[PDB]
DNA sequence: CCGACCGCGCATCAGC
DNA sequence: GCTGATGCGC
DNA sequence: GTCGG
């Protein structure tokens, strides 16, 4: 919490420029500066000390000065006061409620939790089950969860069929001692570029069955979106409800897929930097070469994550190790 | 100065 | 009925 | 809002 007090500051006009300003490009330049910040190992004095990192320019260090002489930023204190901006704001945190839904709403005096649940005619579906599990998708995974979720989804699509390969990808893998949600990665040999149906469905329906998904958000022949529940104990309180994604990719690309969903954002970009000095190109599909000019040639044979990493001359970085 | 800032799968809607 | 645009999440 | 061409 060395720069506790600015990096809240700037997450707080993050989440303004996003929701209400519907500003998508500001919300990040603002959560990168706050990032950086984060990280930097001394109490800031200055904004222009801060103005020094990379993400952090003119405005920001501006709002740094302000907030250090004054312990407060008077463009925050209006935005908090303002009713519509801080009901705007509250109501995208409605997992399908995003910027334009949530003016709308407020618009017609539909501002809070209450207001949704007396009005779930005019939710769409996704809408209404992230008002239903408001509270539980705001509470983060501890490992040891997650862990208990990893064995039920690997166990029960191996019993859909043997050579399925499921792999629990981002936060998670990368070893973090809690997660936001759970991001399965899925495959079957039998599913190429160049190619049996209802992959994701049998999946998707075996963990069902075992009543582990209890809710869908979206689904389709490639991607499934829902929530999940570990089993309680017949004594014990149930467990909170849980935002799943699965996610079907062809097993050509799936270690590619692999890669990219377990991150980090900072890993994957400094990844991708280090492939092009070599004379290649990643993206979440393909390792591809580098003509002359340029020009990608075709995709390279992958069937590990480790095959990624000799392409471009890089020992392997373990999960845990990706940080950055 | 000024364009880019990831962009795609799914759900939903406007227009044909 | 269809297609393309958009909101949303990530 | 920041960055870089
Ligand atoms: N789960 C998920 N992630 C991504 C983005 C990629 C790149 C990112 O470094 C990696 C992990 O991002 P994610 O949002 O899952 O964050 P994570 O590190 O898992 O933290 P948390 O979810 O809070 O536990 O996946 C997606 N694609 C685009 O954003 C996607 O559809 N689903
Ligand atoms: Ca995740
Ligand atoms: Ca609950
Ligand atoms: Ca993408
Ligand atoms: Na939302
Ligand atoms: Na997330």
């Known amino acids: 919490t060395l720069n506790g007090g600015i990096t809240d500051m700037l997450t707080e006009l993050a989440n303004f420029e996003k929701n209400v300003s519907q500003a998508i490009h500001k919300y990040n330049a603002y959560r990168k500066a706050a990032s950086v910040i984060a990280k930097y190992p001394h109490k800031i004095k200055s904004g222009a000390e801060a103005k020094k990192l990379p993400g ?19 463009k925050l204190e209006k935005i908090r006061q303002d009713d519509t901006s801080s009901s705007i704001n509250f109501l995208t945190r409605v997992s399908g409620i995003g910027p334009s839904a949530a003016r709308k709403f407020v618009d017609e005096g539909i501002k809070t939790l209450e207001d949704l ?11 209404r089950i992230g008002l239903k599990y408001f509270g539980d998708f705001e509470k983060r995974i501890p490992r040891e969860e997650m862990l208990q979720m990893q064995d039920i989804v690997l ?29 399965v990665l899925l495959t079957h040999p039998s599913f190429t570029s160049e190619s049996q149906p209802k992959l994701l469905h049998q ?41 799943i994604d699965i996610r079907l990719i062809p097993k050509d690309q ?25 004379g290649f190109t990643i993206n979440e599909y393909t390792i591809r070469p580098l003509g002359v000019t340029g020009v990608a040639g075709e995709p390279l044979p992958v069937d590990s994550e480790k095959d990624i990493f000799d392409y471009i001359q890089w020992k392997y970085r373990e999960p845990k190790d990706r940080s950055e």
């Open 56 to 74: 952090v320019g003119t405005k920001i260090a501006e709002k740094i000065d302000e907030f250090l002489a004054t312990g407060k930023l008077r």
């Open 117 to 127: 649940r007396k009005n779930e005619d005019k939710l769409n579906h996704h809408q």
């Open 155 to 183: 166990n029960e699509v191996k019993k859909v069929d043997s050579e399925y390969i499921a792999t629990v990808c981002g936060s998670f893998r990368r070893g973090a001692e809690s997660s936001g949600d759970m991001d």
């Open 203 to 243: 999946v998707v329906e075996q963990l069902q069955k075992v009543h582990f998904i209890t809710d869908t958000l979206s689904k389709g022949e490639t991607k499934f979106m829902g929530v999940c529940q570990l089993p309680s104990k017949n004594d014990e309180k149930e467990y909170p409800h849980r935002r």
């Open 254 to 278: 799936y270690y590619c897929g692999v890669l990219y969903f377990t991150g980090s954002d900072i890993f994957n970009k400094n990844m991708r930097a280090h492939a092009l000095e070599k």
